[PDB]
Amino acid sequence: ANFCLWNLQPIMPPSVRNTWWFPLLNTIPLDQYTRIYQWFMGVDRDRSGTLEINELMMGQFPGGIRLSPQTALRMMRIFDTDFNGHISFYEFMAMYKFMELAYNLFVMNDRNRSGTLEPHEILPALQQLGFYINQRTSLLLHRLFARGMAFCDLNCWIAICAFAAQTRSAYQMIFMNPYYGPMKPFNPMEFGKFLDVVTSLLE
Amino acid sequence: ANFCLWNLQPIMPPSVRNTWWFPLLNTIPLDQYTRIYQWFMGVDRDRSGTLEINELMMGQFPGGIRLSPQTALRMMRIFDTDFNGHISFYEFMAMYKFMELAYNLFVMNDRNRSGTLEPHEILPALQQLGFYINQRTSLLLHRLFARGMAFCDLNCWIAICAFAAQTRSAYQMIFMNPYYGPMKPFNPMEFGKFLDVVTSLLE
Ligand SMILES: [Ca+2]
Ligand SMILES: [Ca+2]
Ligand SMILES: [Ca+2]
Ligand SMILES: [Ca+2]
Ligand code: NA
Ligand code: NA
């Protein structure tokens, strides 16, 4: 029963191949490729062969996820790895799989089937996903993204997951500066501390 | 005519002495100590001998600066370096001097005396202060903190400066983790790249 983003067991331009989220693509079995393409086509309202931010805001996603302008921009920042303002099919496959994983995890953690997680339920769920933050940070993420809501509905969960993932992208961008010395092996306990610190900047 | 935070020419618990902003204290001449104390006393509405976040939100500061709940929390996060939820007189001396420097810089850059900077005027002013960000980042900082306002008034300038300074604190906290190797000399060009990346997370 594995949801850890750093441990995804296997079941393309350099921009897609050299991202931290590339292993998501390797969890997609052949039969799912065409199903994801049908989903892509649904979201691509102007049939351009690419997803634009407006289309992200109007799309339906796994589990009925929908995206605020802010979360859609996060999804762009994570998955638009050639920085062209468009999501290609390959970038979308990873975005899709990320959403699917996050949705499945939400459902598993919604044990009373309320359609929400309580704020104290957020930490262990994020830990399953590979984000090793502290309790203070977990409760702050709920306040930051819940828009005043008492609990964490699925869309709020995805907003939170998107911020965590975008912070992972920011980490890779920061640390590929050779000023900081050779790239160290990715360590999720150390990255968790980074996410703790960076989250506090949004408050 | 120097405003660079990393180059402040000289004119205490370890928590105050070992902060990146400690050189601010060394720009305070003896005669200003008692004037800053009078200011401190004004803000300390309950005479506790310490400033609390509510008092920051109700205080008047150099140049008529006032603080939103969000900016007041930033000021706490920068200057409360023993993490006790209170601003001591020593922490306040640095906060005061930071505000004074930022206010003087705003005034110098408000060449038409409009009480505002245009968004394109923000970058060179931040560069004077020692924040070496790109133009994209400068315009984003205005959108993030201006609350819809077309231009950047003094309070919006301080909100922006506070975020930049708090990101400098986050940088020191991140990089004192020995996982990232020995602490490198502070390099403002490299830190500017870090601020570019981190700002994008707020959008
Ligand atoms: Ca399209
Ligand atoms: Ca792209
Ligand atoms: Ca007080
Ligand atoms: Ca303190
Ligand atoms: Na529930
Ligand atoms: Na002006």
**Ligand nearest A117 Cα, by number?**
5
Say yes or no for a CB contact (<8 Å) between A180 and B184: yes
- CA of B72, closest CA in chain A: separation in Å? 11
Q: Rounded to whole angstroms, how far apart are CA atoms A141 and B83?
A: 20
The secondary structure element, H or E, covering residue A201 is helix A188-202
- CA of A200, closest CA in chain B: separation in Å? 9
**Residue B107: Cβ within 10 Å count:** 13
Helices (H), B25-134: 30-43, 53-58, 69-79, 89-109, 122-129
Say yes or no for a CB contact (<8 Å) between B201 and A200: no
Resolution in angstroms comes to: 1.9
B197 at the A interface (CB within 8 A)? yes
Q: Burial, B2: exposed, middle or buried (Cβ in 10 Å; 0-12, 13-18, 19+)?
A: exposed
Q: Rounded to whole angstroms, how far apart are CA atoms A72 and A158?
A: 10
Structure-block tokens of residue A171 = 């980490």
The secondary structure element, H or E, covering residue B6 is none
Pairing relationship of beta strands B152-153 and B116-117 according to DSSP bridges: antiparallel
| CATH code, domain carrying B177 | 1.10.238.10
The secondary structure element, H or E, covering residue B140 is helix B135-145
Q: Rounded to whole angstroms, how far apart are CA atoms B13 and B19?
A: 11
- Calculate Rg over the CA atoms of chain A: 16
Residue A172: C-alpha distances to residues A168, B125, B197 (Å): 6, 29, 10
Centre of ligand 1 to C-alpha A166, Å, is 23
Range of the domain at B191: 1-203
Find the closest chain B residue to A171 by CA distance. Answer: B197
B145 at the A interface (CB within 8 A)? no
In the Cβ-directed half-sphere of B150, how many Cα atoms lie within 13 Å? 2
Query: CB–CB of A170/A112 below 8 Å?
Result: no
- Calculate Rg over the CA atoms of chain B: 16
Give the number of A-B residue pairs with CB atoms closer than 8 Å. Answer: 55
Least Cα distance to A198 among A173, A164, A172, A175 occurs for A164
Q: Provide the number of structural domains found in chain B.
A: 1
Say yes or no for a CB contact (<8 Å) between B167 and A77: no
Task: Report the residue from A77, A163, A184 with minimal CB separation from B179.
Answer: A184
Method of structure determination: X-ray
Helices (H), A11-68: 14-17, 30-43, 53-58
Find the closest chain B residue to A168 by CA distance. Answer: B201
Q: Rounded to whole angstroms, how far apart are CA atoms A128 and A190?
A: 16
Q: Is A152 helix (H, G, I), strand (E, B) or coil?
A: strand
Least Cα distance to A37 among A23, A51, A19, A18 occurs for A51
Question: How many helices (H) and strands (E) are present in chain A, helices listed first?
Answer: 9, 2
Angle at which helices B188-202 and A188-202 cross, to 10°: 70
Say yes or no for a CB contact (<8 Å) between A198 and B198: yes
Say yes or no for a CB contact (<8 Å) between B166 and A201: yes
B185 at the A interface (CB within 8 A)? no
Q: Rounded to whole angstroms, how far apart are CA atoms A65 and A88?
A: 20
Residue A21: C-alpha distances to residues A16, A109, A125, B81, B166 (Å): 9, 23, 19, 36, 29
Interface test with chain B among A179, A193, A203, by most B beta carbons within 10 Å: A179
Q: Rounded to whole angstroms, how far apart are CA atoms B19 and B36?
A: 20
Interface test with chain A among B53, B171, B200, by most A beta carbons within 10 Å: B200
Least Cα distance to A49 among A91, A2, A13 occurs for A91
Annotated binding residues of B, written as ranges, equal: 44, 46, 48, 50, 52, 55, 80, 82, 84, 86, 91
